[PDB]
Design a protein around this ligand. Structure first.
Ligand SMILES: C[S@@+](CC[C@H](N)C(=O)[O-])C[C@H]1O[C@@H](n2cnc3c(N)ncnc32)[C@H](O)[C@@H]1O
Ligand SMILES: C[S@@+](CC[C@H](N)C(=O)[O-])C[C@H]1O[C@@H](n2cnc3c(N)ncnc32)[C@H](O)[C@@H]1O
Lengths: 188, 188
């Protein structure tokens, strides 16, 4: 059900340009942007996943500015949307947290512009979320996309958005928005 | 039809916090982000509308870096998506440009998180785009939203995304993504 859906923005492990594994910087706008989308569709949590202590520090400081500091008193909803945000160092820590919260490890939905074998449609994904009592975790990449090691542990790969177009390389913010709208939509 | 749809990001006239009319800075990521969304869904053009010469200069320089300069040789598709981008000083200049291109002034679709009287659903909007031979222009706001003077000249107001939610204050990048997916979707 729609009150048990999570999203995670992955910064490590991430594919580099030579796809080697890299660890990306967190772009500040990604935190605010995807938090607002998650909040709008009543998702349970938004995880920012990064093993870079400099990034963890920047995100933590930013979070308390907007959640506790001056920022929390001149927005309203920066802070409302940002309450959903949790920082974690690794995907495994995300999985462990959801298991603690939900009593159960989540179904993992891999996302990619690049067509994979054995994927599901968004209609098929919506059906799963409707019919399941399991928590669902939507994974979003940075850099040059989510790596094979994460693909290997994903339960489902959602088909690419606009797979038959001549161009479908969306930002992660635009992709997240569309993915969440297709899966949750105007259902309350 | 889907090969005659435009999007414009409005920075002036825009509602300020006291909603007074203000002129907003163009956030660089908005140019790249919404260009990719427009390109993915095969929209005809993406207008960046700003009457601030400092903003027009920053955007122009950025455009040629990615379209002509070094940027054009180490992406592929930054430059592909950015080809859709046109800078204009005023909404009127956008309308005038589309009239020159299409032989006809466009139908204007106003967008807002805030519920208005006399709006259309996305289903109703999709129908218009399917059945029309007129160009369509989707307007997106910055700051605290599109002002009444722009509302007054809009042919249609699309209903808010997630109007019945307790929170629907999306970023313009996330909103644009969802609006475009709802109107165009997986239609080729
Ligand atoms: C490759 S990353 C980096 C993209 C870009 N450089 C940016 O500024 O965000 C984009 C991420 O968004 C998601 N994404 C982008 N396009 C998508 C599509 N067409 N279908 C499904 N997911 C997509 C995937 O999760 C992907 O890992
Ligand atoms: C008010 S502006 C500024 C929002 C935010 N400060 C940002 O960083 O983008 C957001 C714009 O995105 C569009 N928008 C946002 N939420 C929307 C919604 N729920 N339904 C339709 N359009 C929306 C509107 O065009 C609006 O003018």
């Amino acid at each position: 059900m729609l009150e048990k859906v999570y999203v995670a923005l992955i910064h490590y492990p991430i594919k580099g340009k030579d796809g080697s594994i890299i660890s990306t910087a967190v772009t500040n706008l990604d935190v605010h942007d995807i938090a607002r989308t998650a909040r709008t569709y009543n998702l349970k949590g938004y995880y920012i996943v990064t093993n870079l202590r400099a990034q963890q520090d920047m995100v933590s400081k930013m979070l308390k500015f907007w959640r506790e500091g001056f920022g929390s008193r001149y927005n309203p909803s920066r802070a409302e949307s940002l309450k959903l945000v949790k920082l974690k160092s690794y995907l495994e820590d995300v999985l462990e947290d959801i298991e603690s919260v939900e009593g159960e490890r989540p179904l993992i939905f891999f996302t990619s512009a690049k067509k994979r074998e054995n994927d599901i449609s968004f209609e098929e994904g919506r059906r799963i979320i409707i019919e399941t009592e399991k928590p669902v975790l939507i994974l979003l990449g940075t850099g040059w996309g989510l790596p094979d090691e994460i693909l290997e542990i994903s339960d489902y790969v959602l088909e690419p958005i606009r797979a038959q177009s001549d161009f479908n390389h969306l930002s992660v913010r635009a992709a997240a928005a569309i993915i969440i709208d297709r899966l949750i939509g105007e259902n309350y």
